[PDB]
Amino acid sequence: TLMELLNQMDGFDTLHRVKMIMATNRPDTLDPALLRPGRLDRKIHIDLPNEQARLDILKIHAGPITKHGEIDYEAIVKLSDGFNGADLRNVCTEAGMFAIRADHDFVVQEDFMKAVRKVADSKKLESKLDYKPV
Amino acid sequence: KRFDSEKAGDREVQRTMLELLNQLDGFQPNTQVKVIAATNRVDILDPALLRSGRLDRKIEFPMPNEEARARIMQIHSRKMNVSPDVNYEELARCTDDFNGAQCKAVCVEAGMIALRRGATELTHEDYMEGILEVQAKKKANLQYYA
Amino acid sequence: TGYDLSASTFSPDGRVFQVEYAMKAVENSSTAIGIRCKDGVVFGVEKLVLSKLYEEGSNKRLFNVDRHVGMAVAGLLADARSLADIAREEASNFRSNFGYNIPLKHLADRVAMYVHAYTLYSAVRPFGCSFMLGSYSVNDGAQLYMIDPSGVSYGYWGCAIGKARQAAKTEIEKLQMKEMTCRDIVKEVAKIIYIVHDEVKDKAFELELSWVGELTNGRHEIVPKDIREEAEKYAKESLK
Amino acid sequence: SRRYDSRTTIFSPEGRLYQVEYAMEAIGHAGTCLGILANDGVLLAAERRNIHKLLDEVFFSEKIYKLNEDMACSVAGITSDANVLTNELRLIAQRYLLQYQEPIPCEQLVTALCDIKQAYTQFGGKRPFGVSLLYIGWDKHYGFQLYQSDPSGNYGGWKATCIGNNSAAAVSMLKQDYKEGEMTLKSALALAIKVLNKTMDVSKLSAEKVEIATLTRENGKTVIRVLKQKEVEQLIKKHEEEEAKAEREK
Amino acid sequence: ERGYSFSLTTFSPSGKLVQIEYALAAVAGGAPSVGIKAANGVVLATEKKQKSILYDERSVHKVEPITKHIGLVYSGMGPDYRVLVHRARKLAQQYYLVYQEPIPTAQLVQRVASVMQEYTQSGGVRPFGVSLLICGWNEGRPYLFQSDPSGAYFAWKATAMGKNYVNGKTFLEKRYNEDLELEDAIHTAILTLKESFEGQMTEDNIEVGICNEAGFRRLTPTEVKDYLAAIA
Amino acid sequence: NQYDNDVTVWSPQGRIHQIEYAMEAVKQGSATVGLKSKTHAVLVALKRAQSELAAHQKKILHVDNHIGISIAGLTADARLLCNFMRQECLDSRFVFDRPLPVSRLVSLIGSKTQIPTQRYGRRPYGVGLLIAGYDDMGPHIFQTCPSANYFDCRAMSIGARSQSARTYLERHMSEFMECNLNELVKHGLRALRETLPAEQDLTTKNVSIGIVGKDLEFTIYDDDDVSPFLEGLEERPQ
Amino acid sequence: YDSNSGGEREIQRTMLELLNQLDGFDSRGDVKVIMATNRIETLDPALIRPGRIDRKIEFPLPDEKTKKRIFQIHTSRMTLADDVTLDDLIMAKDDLSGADIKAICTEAGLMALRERRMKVTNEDFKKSKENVLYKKQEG
Amino acid sequence: YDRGVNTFSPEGRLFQVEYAIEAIKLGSTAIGIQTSEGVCLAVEKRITSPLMEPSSIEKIVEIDAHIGCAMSGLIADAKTLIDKARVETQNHWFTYNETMTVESVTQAVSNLALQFGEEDSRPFGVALLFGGVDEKGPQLFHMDPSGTFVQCDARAIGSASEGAQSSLQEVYHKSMTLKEAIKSSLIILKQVMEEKLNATNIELATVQPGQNFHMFTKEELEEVIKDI
Amino acid sequence: SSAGFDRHITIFSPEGRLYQVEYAFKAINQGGLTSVAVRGKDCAVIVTQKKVPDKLLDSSTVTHLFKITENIGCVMTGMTADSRSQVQRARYEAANWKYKYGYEIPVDMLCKRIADISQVYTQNAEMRPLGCCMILIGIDEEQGPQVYKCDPAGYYCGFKATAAGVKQTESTSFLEKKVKKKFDWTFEQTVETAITCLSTVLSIDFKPSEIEVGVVTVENPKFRILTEAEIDAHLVALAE
Numbered sequence A: 001t002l003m004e005l006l007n008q009m010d011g012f013d014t015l016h017r018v019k020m021i022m023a024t025n026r027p028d029t030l031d032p033a034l035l036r037p038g039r040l041d042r043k044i045h046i047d048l049p050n051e052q053a054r055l056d057i058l059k060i061h062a063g064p065i066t067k068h069g070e071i072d073y074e075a076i077v078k079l080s081d082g083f084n085g086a087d088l089r090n091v092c093t094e095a096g097m098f099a100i101r102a103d104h105d106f107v108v109q110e111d112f113m114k115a116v117r118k119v120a121d122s123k124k125l126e127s128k129l130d131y132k133p134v
Numbered sequence B: 001k002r003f004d005s006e007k008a009g010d011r012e013v014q015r016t017m018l019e020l021l022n023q024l025d026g027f028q029p030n031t032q033v034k035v036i037a038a039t040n041r042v043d044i045l046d047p048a049l050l051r052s053g054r055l056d057r058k059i060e061f062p063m064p065n066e067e068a069r070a071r072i073m074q075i076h077s078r079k080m081n082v083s084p085d086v087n088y089e090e091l092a093r094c095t096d097d098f099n100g101a102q103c104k105a106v107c108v109e110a111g112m113i114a115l116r117r118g119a120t121e122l123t124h125e126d127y128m129e130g131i132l133e134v135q136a137k138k139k140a141n142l143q144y145y146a
Numbered sequence C: 001t002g003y004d005l006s007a008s009t010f011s012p013d014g015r016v017f018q019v020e021y022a023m024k025a026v027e028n029s030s031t032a033i034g035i036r037c038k039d040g041v042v043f044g045v046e047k048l049v050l051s052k053l054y055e056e057g058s059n060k061r062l063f064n065v066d067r068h069v070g071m072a073v074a075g076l077l078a079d080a081r082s083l084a085d086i087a088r089e090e091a092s093n094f095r096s097n098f099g100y101n102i103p104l105k106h107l108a109d110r111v112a113m114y115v116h117a118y119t120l121y122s123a124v125r126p127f128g129c130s131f132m133l134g135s136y137s138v139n140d141g142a143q144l145y146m147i148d149p150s151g152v153s154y155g156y157w158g159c160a161i162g163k164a165r166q167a168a169k170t171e172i173e174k175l176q177m178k179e180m181t182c183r184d185i186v187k188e189v190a191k192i193i194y195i196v197h198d199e200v201k202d203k204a205f206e207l208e209l210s211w212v213g214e215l216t217n218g219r220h221e222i223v224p225k226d227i228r229e230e231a232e233k234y235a236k237e238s239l240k
Numbered sequence D: 001s002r003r004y005d006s007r008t009t010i011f012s013p014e015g016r017l018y019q020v021e022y023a024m025e026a027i028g029h030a031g032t033c034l035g036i037l038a039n040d041g042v043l044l045a046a047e048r049r050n051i052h053k054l055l056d057e058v059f060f061s062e063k064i065y066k067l068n069e070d071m072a073c074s075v076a077g078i079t080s081d082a083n084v085l086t087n088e089l090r091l092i093a094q095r096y097l098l099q100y101q102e103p104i105p106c107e108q109l110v111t112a113l114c115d116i117k118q119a120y121t122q123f124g125g126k127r128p129f130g131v132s133l134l135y136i137g138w139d140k141h142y143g144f145q146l147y148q149s150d151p152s153g154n155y156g157g158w159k160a161t162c163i164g165n166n167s168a169a170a171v172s173m174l175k176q177d178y179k180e181g182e183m184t185l186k187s188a189l190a191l192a193i194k195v196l197n198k199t200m201d202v203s204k205l206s207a208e209k210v211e212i213a214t215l216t217r218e219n220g221k222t223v224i225r226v227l228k229q230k231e232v233e234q235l236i237k238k239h240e241e242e243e244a245k246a247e248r249e250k
Numbered sequence E: 001e002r003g004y005s006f007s008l009t010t011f012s013p014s015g016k017l018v019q020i021e022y023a024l025a026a027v028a029g030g031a032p033s034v035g036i037k038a039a040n041g042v043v044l045a046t047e048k049k050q051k052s053i054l055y056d057e058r059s060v061h062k063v064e065p066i067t068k069h070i071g072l073v074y075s076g077m078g079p080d081y082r083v084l085v086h087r088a089r090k091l092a093q094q095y096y097l098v099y100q101e102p103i104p105t106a107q108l109v110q111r112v113a114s115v116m117q118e119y120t121q122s123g124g125v126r127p128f129g130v131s132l133l134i135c136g137w138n139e140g141r142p143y144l145f146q147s148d149p150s151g152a153y154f155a156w157k158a159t160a161m162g163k164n165y166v167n168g169k170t171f172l173e174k175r176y177n178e179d180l181e182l183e184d185a186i187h188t189a190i191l192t193l194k195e196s197f198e199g200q201m202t203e204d205n206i207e208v209g210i211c212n213e214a215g216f217r218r219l220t221p222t223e224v225k226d227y228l229a230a231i232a
Numbered sequence F: 001n002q003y004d005n006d007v008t009v010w011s012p013q014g015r016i017h018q019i020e021y022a023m024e025a026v027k028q029g030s031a032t033v034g035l036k037s038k039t040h041a042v043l044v045a046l047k048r049a050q051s052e053l054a055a056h057q058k059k060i061l062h063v064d065n066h067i068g069i070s071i072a073g074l075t076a077d078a079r080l081l082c083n084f085m086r087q088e089c090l091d092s093r094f095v096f097d098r099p100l101p102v103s104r105l106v107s108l109i110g111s112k113t114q115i116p117t118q119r120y121g122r123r124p125y126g127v128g129l130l131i132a133g134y135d136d137m138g139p140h141i142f143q144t145c146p147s148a149n150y151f152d153c154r155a156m157s158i159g160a161r162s163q164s165a166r167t168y169l170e171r172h173m174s175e176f177m178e179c180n181l182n183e184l185v186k187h188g189l190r191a192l193r194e195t196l197p198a199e200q201d202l203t204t205k206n207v208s209i210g211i212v213g214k215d216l217e218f219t220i221y222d223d224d225d226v227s228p229f230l231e232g233l234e235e236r237p238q
Numbered sequence G: 001y002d003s004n005s006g007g008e009r010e011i012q013r014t015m016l017e018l019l020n021q022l023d024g025f026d027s028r029g030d031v032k033v034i035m036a037t038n039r040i041e042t043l044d045p046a047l048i049r050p051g052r053i054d055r056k057i058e059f060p061l062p063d064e065k066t067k068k069r070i071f072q073i074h075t076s077r078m079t080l081a082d083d084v085t086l087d088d089l090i091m092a093k094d095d096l097s098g099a100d101i102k103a104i105c106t107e108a109g110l111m112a113l114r115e116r117r118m119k120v121t122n123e124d125f126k127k128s129k130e131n132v133l134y135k136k137q138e139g
Numbered sequence H: 001y002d003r004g005v006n007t008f009s010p011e012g013r014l015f016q017v018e019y020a021i022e023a024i025k026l027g028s029t030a031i032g033i034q035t036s037e038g039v040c041l042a043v044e045k046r047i048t049s050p051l052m053e054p055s056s057i058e059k060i061v062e063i064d065a066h067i068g069c070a071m072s073g074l075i076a077d078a079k080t081l082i083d084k085a086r087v088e089t090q091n092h093w094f095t096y097n098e099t100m101t102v103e104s105v106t107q108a109v110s111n112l113a114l115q116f117g118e119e120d121s122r123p124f125g126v127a128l129l130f131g132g133v134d135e136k137g138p139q140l141f142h143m144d145p146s147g148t149f150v151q152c153d154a155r156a157i158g159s160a161s162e163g164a165q166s167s168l169q170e171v172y173h174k175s176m177t178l179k180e181a182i183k184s185s186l187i188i189l190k191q192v193m194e195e196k197l198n199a200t201n202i203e204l205a206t207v208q209p210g211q212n213f214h215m216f217t218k219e220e221l222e223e224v225i226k227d228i
Numbered sequence I: 001s002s003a004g005f006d007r008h009i010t011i012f013s014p015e016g017r018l019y020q021v022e023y024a025f026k027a028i029n030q031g032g033l034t035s036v037a038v039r040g041k042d043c044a045v046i047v048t049q050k051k052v053p054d055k056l057l058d059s060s061t062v063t064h065l066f067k068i069t070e071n072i073g074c075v076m077t078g079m080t081a082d083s084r085s086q087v088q089r090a091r092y093e094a095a096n097w098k099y100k101y102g103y104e105i106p107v108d109m110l111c112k113r114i115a116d117i118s119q120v121y122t123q124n125a126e127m128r129p130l131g132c133c134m135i136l137i138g139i140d141e142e143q144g145p146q147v148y149k150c151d152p153a154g155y156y157c158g159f160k161a162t163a164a165g166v167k168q169t170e171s172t173s174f175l176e177k178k179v180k181k182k183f184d185w186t187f188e189q190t191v192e193t194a195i196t197c198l199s200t201v202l203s204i205d206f207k208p209s210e211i212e213v214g215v216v217t218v219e220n221p222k223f224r225i226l227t228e229a230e231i232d233a234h235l236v237a238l239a240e
């Protein structure tokens, strides 16, 4: 099934009007046939978002959630460190869900400076072995 | 998935999980019908599974403690009669590495000698024997201390 | 297989799990903390009582090195007494060659040499014991330090060890590092340790106190628990 | 921490020391030596390991080393591992001269080295000596003494010895030409030359690719003689020439 | 400490030492090195090239002479090179105390290979992958020697080491004939440096020591550009 | 089970199974209960043997005037640390001409057993010592374990089903601090005889008794010394 | 292994099942089982007890007269020359094999058959034995 | 799984030592008896061939004057312990001027029983039977290889050990005399011996305060054989 | 390629590669410390940053920089357990140097000692190889500027632009064409490029309190620990 994928891009044909976008776990096992341009046109990826960029990743998390007006965005950004957008958000929403366990509606960052802090600490236990070859 | 080839059969079936991920990550519709997962151990898997879409809650269940350990078999032995003195601290104090399921079998062999004793009811001297009767190991010998 | 066996042999991740196995072994220990104000350094430890188990006051994890320096340990109790006795008699060497107090910053270097060397040799193992080091003097000042099984010599104005650690030291930031008076901070930290380190799991527990600073004139001993009963005089009303 | 050593000292399920077999293979690989009968003299022959003609060869004897003025020894095995035993036995024979101020009979000297050779075998799981060497010389009692060292600790000494798997074909020739006095040093020269001619696979039996040494008993010299290549050239040429006269039976 | 000192490197079923075979593999994967013993003295060249432009030849040297009249080169790792050099400098005093005179070339090779062969039977690690080239001038005729991990040493006029040691030597066999001079030895040293070049003919990519009967002379890369600029 | 290889290697949970295996031999020993009141202390042990005619091996043995002890674990290593304990007894009896407070002495026993736990090839020592001692501050009862963790208690026990003794102790032992020597002795067998299987004695030669106090010197009590202790009580109700 | 195989346990268990099927549950069937390997080491020692328990034959190496007893059975058919003698050759030779002492006659079955002669000659059989001697010595 | 040779057991105990305790079961059979008139004992020499010389094999040795000993399983290691303990009995006579007590042989042997260790060397499989008479009268003592000491009125070792003691439990009583202990024991001895009873099969070992040493003498054992 | 315990100890592979110390190369990434060094004409600069878990972090124990002597100083990377012990060994080598030799140390021979020490520990695998990276500066007469870096592989090399750590591959690769060329080096010029190389990977432009930056120029040869005031003056000086 790989041989055709090669030959389809190995043409004999011009596919230029199609844009092939490729992403997966690792860019390693693909064998060098794919790894060259043509089949793989450019190299783009993601790394751990900077806390400066994570400051913005929380806004789009903090936007849909309304609470009491007490917020320091850099608090969670300076407390909770080295995460991902979903990892932050989901736990940030989980913190709101962990804080709403008390049945009270609006929650200050207090619980979140605790929950997101403590909960992601458990989530960073399985952050092990996430660093993969290029 | 292993990591490098060659080869795993579930390496193709990991994509079922990756589609399970693609349905919980790249696809919206998975929102309803909340799904839970379990293993005997979390040892080695695809570690990227951390998210709300993929697995989120990680709750380590330790060895049951004397709170549960006294109560577990107490609720397992509430099905059966008891000579109305049992410490339940005796086990709970002396329970070390004992699993909550082993405590289910502690009352069994204790009740099994109670069977072959022709006894009407189970007593702690019969209970506490079943502690060291099921675990651990031996027989070997008792000597040079006695 | 078994890259984690020997301490002198590395692992594919670039470390040794013998240190990591000893790290999380300290996590099973109860509360071991320290905090330093301008006037001194407050110490406290929560004793876990399995059943009775024995008389009150026996084999407390709070230890002592010199009149100005003391030990608050965690992890295995015997090897804690070991490194406590080693640092105990080590101050006598500095007292013999010089005759004044041993600086705590460079006293932790000795324990750093002992713990690190035990991680060097394959015959011996690393020690699974951590501890806290703190002190105050008029010619020195307040220095608190923290050493773990990895042999790291470092310190904070306050720190925690055990099950509840990062959650216990979070709200401690309300207590100031300088402006606060550690005499009153005794009960101030007592309300934290009483509320934190949840006792619902094991109902039987006990609390110890100690202090060192200027009020005792560079003397490290236990501020009396039987006097004024400052521990539970407040914290009983803190959780309600 | 007990699983790291390979237990070379400890006994093996085969009923004997297992490393001694691979030790006899160490000497039994690329090692080529022999011995000649002793009648009013003795000689030695070996194989020169160097195939490079650009080498200097300013060290005179290559594989043969001189332990004593009147007594030397042939060696087969790893070079430096043998060179450790050269100076060691040289110092053992020197401390004997340091004792009696008089040369050393080879008997107690070889047994002394055998007691040293068993050191690596009997303790610590040490690697046994991968070198087995010969013995030559002269004494006041038995005259010319030709001995042999074994990795098992025995002295296998004979007046005609064999070293190496290729030299194992010469043992049949040694007993086919076997005589006693009778044999002249010249007869042993042609004997060992035909030994190499049968064993060594070198075409025409090149003289510069194999080592040859001799010994004589003189009063009070008793010289261990390193020979120029001139007489060995004409020796092997005159040898195969005599073999050209030995094929006349057809 | 432990202090096991056991011999764990043992005989292969063929009789050789597999670890020493790994040692000669570290030498075979070593940097190109060559030296030439001809007439008056010996010439050493080899190669040194930094991993980037951040390094210079003016401070750290791959060639440190053992004595004023005795130079040395080698292949393999530098850390273990300076280790055996440190032992060579110390051992030079054990000789000089009794003799009160300089030392012959082969006199170092005897005791160095003995300690090296001792380090084989001895516990821990082995001679590793450092194959040293010892040279010097004594008794009017200089010398060039090289040993191996197992301790086997041989004498010759010239040899190639490191990578492509067989190809460069077969080129030196046809070029070197009869005897050569110091200038001719340096000339064909540029030829064997141009074999694996890379960095031949450039003063900063190589270092040239030269032994003479008047004693060893270590010239800066300045003289390497003097003779070869203008190379050949 | 390659993680249990040596005391050097730590279990995946950060523990050593070698100490846990030494705790087994401590529990495999005979049931023995030491105890102390506010004034005087008493310690009771259990003698056992192999065959009928084989004499019951004594557990309680004298060490110092104010120090009685129980024993369990390997008798060879027990006598090793017993003669080593005599070396510790002659320390202050020689230099200071007065005995040693036992608190700091057992701490030296902990440092003595620390080296065999650390280095490779060294093993812990199974120890069943229940140490009673008297300084001027009153009695001390110290349990001993291969982990060298000692508890100062009014009473404790080590042996087979020795926890059932403690369960009978607590509510009773709180009132046992008041009582004097005699009943404080038979309170020891008020533990042992419950820890003993109900189908057999509890004989004269299988029990060990000793009594020590601040003003009282320790002595081994067995055979005819157990006559007042056996009489005056009743059998356990079936 | 040839082709594709693994791991050890599946090859370990196919031998473990080989005995466990032969163990067996519960098989009277014979097929009297003869088994051999020249290296006693590598086999799992548990194969002995279920069966065969009583017998593992020890093969002694040939002695001097056994080589004499063995040799003539071959040369019985191959006619020897006048000077050919069984004893002296194998008397001097040591640690042979029955296969060799059988196959040492084949080398004379070349040259004598190259001359197409029904008769063995010891002048060759001596000299040609060097080839089989070279076969054991150098090979 | 061979680990350190010093490793404990999870049950548990020392691996290598307990394995040698089971190795005692293949030794010779010897039965001592404690009697107010004296402590007797006997052993089976276990003839391995008719060429055996009777006086060359003895399983009982004499430590002190009135103190005897026996061997089990492996021999030479115990034979070293014999004379090495005799040096301590002579050092006992140095300061104390008198004979070493039979109970103190425990502290003279069982304390040093296993000192073995990897650094600064292997355990023993031999159990000793200590006979003797101290100032308190006859004493029969027995020790194991691990150093655990116990006082036994009758003790059997080696093969017949479990079988001999199980059978001898009935015939033994507090009133057993000397001559009765000898002739009632050889009934068990003739049951636990494979070869036909003769002078070379078994030897007697006795210690008495008034008759010694004795030990025992030959050609008298034949007079007891006809009294079978 | 592996025979027995080979994977867990130090010997040579078929290619002669070491398995243990290649784990020590990834033993530097613990903590994420990045130290860059830029040595100019008359000066030598060190720049390193830190991570702050919380406000309890002490400012006195912030400094990761070490000072060999009053003239010369050091900077370490990787796990701090091996760094503190290896620095104390440099204290022993420098104190013994001035004692017996009695003159200025070239800092080249000190790097020769540490290069052999980490090598001797790489020799025998039964003690920890000590994969910590050793980086220093130097001050010596007639030789101009001096910077030497002792790598855990057992060799010593250092020059004008040299650095070691996780992210130094990127930054120093930019420093290849950036440094020279012709570029002349002054004080503020060497410190500027020390900031820009940090601005390649990070570009955070955070306040000076976070960086640990040493610098040594030759006027008074004594090296001085920098105060955040002058770095703040250089931070506003690099903003155009």
Ligand SMILES: Nc1ncnc2c1ncn2[C@@H]1O[C@H](COP(=O)(O)OP(=O)(O)O)[C@@H](O)[C@H]1O
Pocket: A006, A009, A010, A011, A033, A036, A037, A038, A039
């Ligand atoms: N002139 C060229 N020379 C070499 N490679 C080229 C050239 N032009 C295109 N390519 C590369 O070759 C690839 C297609 O080559 P092709 O031979 O079809 O692949 P394959 O060899 O795998 O069948 C393209 O991805 C392209 O990047």
